[PDB]
Structure formats: structure tokens, C-alpha cells
Amino acid sequence: STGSATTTPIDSLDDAYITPVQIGTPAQTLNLDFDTGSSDLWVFSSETTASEVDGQTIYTPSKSTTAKLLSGATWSISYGDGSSSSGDVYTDTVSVGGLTVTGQAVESAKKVSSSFTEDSTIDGLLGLAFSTLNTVSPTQQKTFFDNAKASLDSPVFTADLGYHAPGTYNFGFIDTTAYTGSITYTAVSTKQGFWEWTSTGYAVGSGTFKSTSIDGIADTGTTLLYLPATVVSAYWAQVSGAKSSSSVGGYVFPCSATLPSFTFGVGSARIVIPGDYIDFGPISTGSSSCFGGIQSSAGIGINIFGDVALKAAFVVFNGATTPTLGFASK
Numbered sequence: 001s002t003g004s005a006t007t008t009p010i011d012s013l014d015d016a017y018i019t020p021v022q023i024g025t026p027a028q029t030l031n032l033d034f035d036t037g038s039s040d041l042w043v044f045s046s047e048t049t050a051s052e053v054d055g056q057t058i059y060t061p062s063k064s065t066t067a068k069l070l071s072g073a074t075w076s077i078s079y080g081d082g083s084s085s086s087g088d089v090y091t092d093t094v095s096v097g098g099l100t101v102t103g104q105a106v107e108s109a110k111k112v113s114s115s116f117t118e119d120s121t122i123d124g125l126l127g128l129a130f131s132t133l134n135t136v137s138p139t140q141q142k143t144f145f146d147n148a149k150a151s152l153d154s155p156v157f158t159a160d161l162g163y164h165a166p167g168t169y170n171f172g173f174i175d176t177t178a179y180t181g182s183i184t185y186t187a188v189s190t191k192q193g194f195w196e197w198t199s200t201g202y203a204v205g206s207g208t209f210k211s212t213s214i215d216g217i218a219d220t221g222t223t224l225l226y227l228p229a230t231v232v233s234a235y236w237a238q239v240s241g242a243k244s245s246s247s248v249g250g251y252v253f254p255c256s257a258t259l260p261s262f263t264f265g266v267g268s269a270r271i272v273i274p275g276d277y278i279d280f281g282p283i284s285t286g287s288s289s290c291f292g293g294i295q296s297s298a299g300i301g302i303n304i305f306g307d308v309a310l311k312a313a314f315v316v317f318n319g320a321t322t323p324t325l326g327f328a329s330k
């Protein structure tokens with residue numbers, strides 16, 4: 001089997017991407033944030049505290065002939081941005097882009113934090129990290145990808161995120177028309193439950209490439225690129241007027257600037273992030289200070305190749321017995 005679904009930015013800054021997912025029978029279509037940095041499939045639902053719902057489409061298990069309460073199971077998750085959600089669990093039929101899994105754990109939110117309530121475009125998350133991170137207790141549950149795997153033509157999914165444009169998540173096949181040149185594969189560690197890999201270095205604009213190992217995670221659910229303070233300082237030093245602002249919460253730069261590109265290494269390959277991708281626009285409406293798309297990971301504890309980096313590439317998440325990550329230009 002295979003699946004193929006279009007993923008669409010939620011706003012003009014590509015803050016996140018939503019992908020339609022069919023849940024239950026008859027289908028209830030919810031727009032989920034596919035997140036390679038977590039392992040829970042959770043939704044706004046008929047159980048979500050009413051005051052915490054503001055425009056989202058909800059899953060109503062009582063209207064699904066295939067929904068079953070997973071008795072006694074609960075879940076609770078906190079994300080790197082401080083947001084959180086929790087609730088109970090159903091099993092139901094879930095389809096993404098034509099690929100169907102039966103008996104998928106669908107985690108129904110009873111409570112969500114304010115950032116979720118305030119984002120009316122996101123009806124929940126679909127986790128694509130390793131199932132060892134799944135938060136359901138007392139019986140941990142599998143991700144959609146892990147449940148789908150045995151039916152897939154090939155044990156892979158691919159992320160092809162757009163810059164200010166729709167893109168695609170494919171399951172079970174590599175679309176050889178969706179990238180240019182070759183795909184370069186690199187080793188993954190699952191020790192922390194993430195798609196964790198080691199970049200071979202970086203360059204700023206037209207500068208020389210610095211060979212240096214940077215361990216980090218491929219995370220479609222994080223907007224920005226978070227790298228060591230040394231690397232980030234070297235980048236912003238090339239932008240006149242750029243500085244780190246504790247009041248704003250990171251690097252800002254004059255909106256009149258032209259940003260250099262940023263290159264990261266994947267083995268002997270090089271992925272170039274255009275300067276435009278690194279511009280996240282005014283810090284507040286009408287400001288002439290703009291927020292940077294490359295930020296320090298120093299306060300986070302892990303480097304994160306988020307959407308800023310990933311949308312510059314066609315990315316293969318290879319979930320074979322020995323997992324790997326592939327990157328190609330596009």
C-alpha cells in the first residue's frame with residue numbers, strides 16, 4: 001500500500017503545516033499537524049473542555065461506528081515550546097492520503113493549552129517520531145506510521161514541505177519526480193526516540209564550509225532551525241544590525257536587510273537554505289525589526305532541524321530495521 005497527502009502552510013509565515021486526515025466511519029476529516037518530533041496522534045474532540053475550543057473541527061467518537069474506547073488509557077504530553085494537551089483514548093480507523101490503518105490509537109483531548117486553543121487551523125497532531133515516545137499509559141501505543149509499516153510497499157515516509165506553498169507527505173514510496181539529483185542518506189540514532197542524525201557542517205552565504213559534527217533532530221513540528229550558539233553567532237554576524245534580544249526571545253535583524261543563505265552538510269552533500277527562508281518578518285505588526293529563522297539551541301538541550309531547514313529539501317524518513325534519513329535538493 002501507499003498514501004499521498006498534500007500538506008498546506010497554516011499562515012503566511014509557514015509557522016506549521018496541516019494535512020487532512022480521515023478518522024472514523026463515516027469519515028470525519030480533521031486537519032492535523034504532522035510532527036516527526038513526537039509520537040502521539042491527538043485530536044480536538046467532543047470531550048475537549050468547551051472554553052478551550054475556538055474554531056477547530058472536532059472528532060466525535062460517538063458518531064463513528066468503528067470507534068472504541070481504549071478503557072483506562074490516558075495520555076499527557078508537553079512540547080518543546082511549553083504547550084501541552086491531555087485526555088483519554090479511542091481506537092478507530094484512520095486514513096491519510098488513501099492509506100488506511102485500522103485500530104489506530106486516536107488520543108482525544110480533554111484539555112489543551114492556550115497556544116492550541118488560539119490556533120484555529122490545527123485540529124490536532126499526528127506524531128511520526130518513534131513509538132517509544134508515545135505518552136499513552138498504562139499501555140503505550142504505536143504511531144500511524146508504525147501501524148502502517150507492514151502494509152507499506154516500502155517502510156518509508158517522505159516530507160516535501162513548501163516555501164509559502166503546499167507540499168506533500170508520502171507513505172510507502174519515494175517519488176523520484178519530486179527531487180533533483182541524488183538522495184544522500186545518513187545514519188539515525190533512535191536512542192532518544194527522535195529522527196536524530198549528525199550534520200557534517202555548515203556555511204554562511206558564500207563563505208567556506210566548516211566541517212564540524214552537529215547532532216540534531218529532523219522535526220517537522222518545529223518552525224525554525226535551532227543550532228549551537230557558535231554557529232548561530234557566525235550566521236548573524238553577517239547581517240548588519242542583527243542582534244540577540246532577550247526581550248523578543250532571540251535573534252532579530254533590520255527588516256531592510258538582505259539575508260545570506262545557510263548551507264548544512266549531509267555527508268558529502270550540501271543543502272542550501274535560501275536567505276528568504278530565514279526571514280520570519282516583523283516581530284509585531286508594523287515593526288521594522290524582523291525575527292530570525294535561525295536561533296540558538298543553547299536553552300533547549302538539542303539541535304533542531306525544523307521546517308526552515310527541512311523545506312529546503314526532499315526528506316526521506318526510512319523506517320527500515322536500520323533507520324536512516326535521506327536528503328535531496330528540489
Ligand code: PRO
Pocket residue numbers: 070071072073074087088089
Ligand atoms: O474513563 C476512561 O476509561 C478514560 C481513562 C480515564 C479518563 N477516561
